[PDB]
């Protein structure tokens, strides 16, 4: 079939988190944004439109949502407000997310394992690990 839509649309809750501040303040994220952020733990949804793929944070301050093609650069602004040229593609069904801006680069792996969404976050020595399941 085309089952990364099946494994992959839905309401996904968070459920556990490792080194997401640390991450944070690597991205460049100040102190009182980073421990606000990490504390909210909203909700992300993710649709699909045919080629067209959005991922979307439930309402919490510093609202997020992106909408893309697998493979096509395309214009991001993150949720510490930061304008980043992202490309996501789909590698062992693995959705694979990198971010350029200002010679700079982090990436963000999202894998289903079991009934469950682990999503691992990489900005140069620093590595977070957050857990989603369906909502
Ligand atoms: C929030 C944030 C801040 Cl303040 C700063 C830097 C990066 C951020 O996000 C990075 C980031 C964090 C995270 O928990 N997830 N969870 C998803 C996800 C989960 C399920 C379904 C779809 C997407 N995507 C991400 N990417």
Not at 46 to 57: A, E
Request: aromatic letters at 8%.
């Amino acid at each position: 079939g085309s089952h990364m839509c099946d494994a992959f649309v839905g309401t996904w809750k968070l459920v556990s988190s490792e080194n997401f501040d640390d991450y944070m303040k690597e991205v460049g994220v100040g102190f009182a944004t980073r421990k606000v952020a990490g504390m909210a733990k909203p909700n992300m949804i993710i649709s699909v439109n045919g080629d067209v793929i959005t991922i979307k944070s439930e309402s919490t301050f510093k609202n997020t949502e992106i909408s893309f093609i697998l493979g096509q650069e395309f214009d991001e602004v993150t949720a510490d407000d930061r304008k980043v040229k992202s490309t996501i593609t789909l590698d062992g069904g693995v959705l694979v997310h990198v971010q350029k801006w200002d010679g700079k680069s982090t990436t963000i792996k999202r894998k289903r394992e079991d009934d469950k969404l682990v999503v691992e976050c990489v900005m140069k020595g620093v590595t977070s690990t957050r857990v989603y399941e369906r909502a």
